[PDB]
Amino acid sequence: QKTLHIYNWTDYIAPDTVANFEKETGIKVVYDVFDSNEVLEGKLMAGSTGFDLVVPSAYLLERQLTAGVFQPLDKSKLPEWKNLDPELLKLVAKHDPDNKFAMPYMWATTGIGYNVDKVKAVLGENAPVDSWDLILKPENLEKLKSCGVSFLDDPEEVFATVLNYLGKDPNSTKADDYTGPATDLLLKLRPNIRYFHSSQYINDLANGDICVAIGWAGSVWQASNRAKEAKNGVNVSFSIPKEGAMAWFDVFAMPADAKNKDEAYQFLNYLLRPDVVAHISDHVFYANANKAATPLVSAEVRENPGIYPPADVRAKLFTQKVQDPKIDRVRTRAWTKVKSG
Ligand SMILES: [Cl-]
């Protein structure tokens, strides 16, 4: 009996990806899900996870390599590795030099999800939906307060977004930038923010309960697709704003103690087949990292520039740098202060 243990994000695979793999290979898959890097990180820190494959962000993977959590990938067992986009490989290699440990899976941005009709009702037909001004300018957010504003409960993404918007380094290593200007702006916005939460905004966008959110692109597009399938009249869109936004990459990696390594490599090379990961993107509305797969992605996903952004949009994106623990600690205390008001 061949077995394979996978730990992935929620809502991050097609319904039949596992079933098809089982039919093709005869391998029994045990598939478990998490919905935060914090849950994932806690299990990787405790070790003896029992997983053969896990899906960290490339950022988190960088933090764990020095701990020896992962083992290097034998690329000779991944003959379709050549299908991966070399530019995505280079971006992930900022966290994983020479792409030793991780296989790029999916990637997206942190932008603005919004209710088209409710935003235009409050701010007019020319509402600045192409700009972080839509939610980071206090006069705008005061007007959208009534239809509901959510921010991620994610200081790393929110502070980097605020710093970029203010003209600071999105990855500032200077503590005063977090405690001074970034906190000042967030404190001014905070009375207009209904909640800080990194998943309630998906259903709330889809049902019309909130009209603007900071959110992950594909999760906002899932909300939009849910509203369309429900025929409830709700029109959700997503903006990568003109000032730029954070891009991030989720990757497959193999825990150092993984028992089912041959099965794990079969699954990784299965994901490298163009139709497999194209079908996942079709269902979860995230861009995958496989350049061979792109033409196979449905046109409604492939041609969506908030999922597959073109060159002028990608040039404005920034990626997260790992900070000294001193900055981590400053961010955490400042975030506490912001949420409490
Ligand atoms: Cl990342």
Numbering used by the authors: 29 to 369
From the paper:
To gain insight into the evolution and designability of ligand binding and specificity, we analyzed the homologous PBPs, PotF and PotD, which are Escherichia coli putrescine (PUT)-binding protein and spermidine (SPD)-binding protein, respectively. They constitute the first elements of two separate multicomponent uptake systems (PotFGHI and PotABCD) to transport the cationic polyamines PUT and SPD across the cellular membrane. Still, the protein-binding modes differ: PotF shows affinity for PUT and SPD, whereas PotD exclusively binds SPD. Prior to this work, we grafted the seven differences in amino acids from PotD binding pocket onto PotF; this resulted in PotF_SPD, which will be referred to as PotF/D throughout this work to keep naming for mutants more concise.
Unfortunately, we were not able to crystallize F88A after numerous attempts, while high-resolution structures for both other variants were acquired. It seemed the removal of a whole benzene ring in F88A and keeping only a methyl group destabilized the protein by creating a large unoccupied space. To counteract the aforementioned difficulties, we constructed a variant bearing F88L instead of F88A. It acts as a substitute to evaluate whether the structural positioning of Y87 can be altered by removing F88. We obtained high-resolution datasets for this variant in a similar fashion as for the other constructs. To our surprise, all solved structures adopt a PotF/D-like semiclosed conformation. The same behavior is observed in the F88L variant where Leu tries to mimic Phe positioning. In F88L, Y87 remains flipped outside the distal region of the binding pocket. Tyr fills the unoccupied space between the salt bridge residues, interacts with R91 of the salt bridge, and stacks with Q348.
